[PDB]
């Protein structure tokens, strides 16, 4: 058991080294055991056999404007336009093989397209460059998702600065829980 809260409409950054327990803690939240509906973005991409569009809207009704916004915010506009079939391009059937970064951006676009109570984004920028990551973190996680309940797994000080609350884990246990100001008074 970890002492932390999930505040409505706020960004909670979950920080820590490899093996700190970050993915396990997301699983405890989804599994309803922590802290004391869900839109999940896994740290390794996930794609289903189907189109780029089918993978993002993921069984829910298509909304042109909501789709347009998400695609722009996840830096998917340029990628999609370069395909002859564009949005209808078929993935996972032996045909087109996307890059780890493209797959990561689709995974994130699927998570933000979903109308959920809680957004769990497990290291969504791990297979992205530092410039693409900055554009997506600012335009998507911060702006597009401004009043959504988000849990972002990140150890970047640049992201922690923008979080409402931070949870630092160490070997399965909490080290720190609080604001960036509180974290700074330990430097």
């Amino acid at each position, epitope marked *: 058991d970890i002492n932390f809260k999930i505040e409505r409409g706020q960004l909670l950054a979950v*920080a*820590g*080294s*490899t093996g*700190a327990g970050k993915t396990s803690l997301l699983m405890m939240i989804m599994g309803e055991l922590e802290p004391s509906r869900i839109s999940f973005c896994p740290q390794f991409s996930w794609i289903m056999p189907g189109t780029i569009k089918e993978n993002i809207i993921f069984g829910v009704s298509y909304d042109e404007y909501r789709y347009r916004s998400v695609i722009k915010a996840c830096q998917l506009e340029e990628d999609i336009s370069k395909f002859p079939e564009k949005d209808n391009t078929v993935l996972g059937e032996g045909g087109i093989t996307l*890059s*780890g*970064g493209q797959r990561a951006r689709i995974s994130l676009a699927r998570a933000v397209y979903k109308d959920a109570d809680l957004y769990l984004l497990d*290291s969504p*920028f*791990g*297979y*992205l*460059d*530092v*410039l*693409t990551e900055k554009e997506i973190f600012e335009s998507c996680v911060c702006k597009l998702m401004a009043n959504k309940t988000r849990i972002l797994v990140t*150890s*970047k*000080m*640049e992201h*922690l600065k923008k979080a409402d609350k931070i949870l*630092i884990l*160490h070997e399965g246990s909490s*080290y*720190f829980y609080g604001t960036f100001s509180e974290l700074q008074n330990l430097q």
Partner: nanobody
Amino acid sequence: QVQLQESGGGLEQPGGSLRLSCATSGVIFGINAMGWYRQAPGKQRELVATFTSGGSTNYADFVEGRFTISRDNAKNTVYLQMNGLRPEDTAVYYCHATVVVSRYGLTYDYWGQGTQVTVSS
């Protein structure tokens, strides 16, 4: 104070080769992602080649197998072997590192000053 220093830049002719190096100093913990970015005059900074946080390598579309990114974990250095240099490759090449600045794995992104790479006939 964490500091990154690029070297190896210079004037080359089309089809030429160059090797860019990036040394680091003041690294107390470790460096995770390291990589190479560039910006031509009046153009926006763009990726060349980088080590992702995952440990994989990600190259820009324009590289087309010409460039190779290497890393020395013991020295905390990053390299870019460039071949088949084109006039379009002319830019200020910047070094980047996601440096671990805490004992809890918290990081800060650091950039070098840049090195000029000029490809001209």
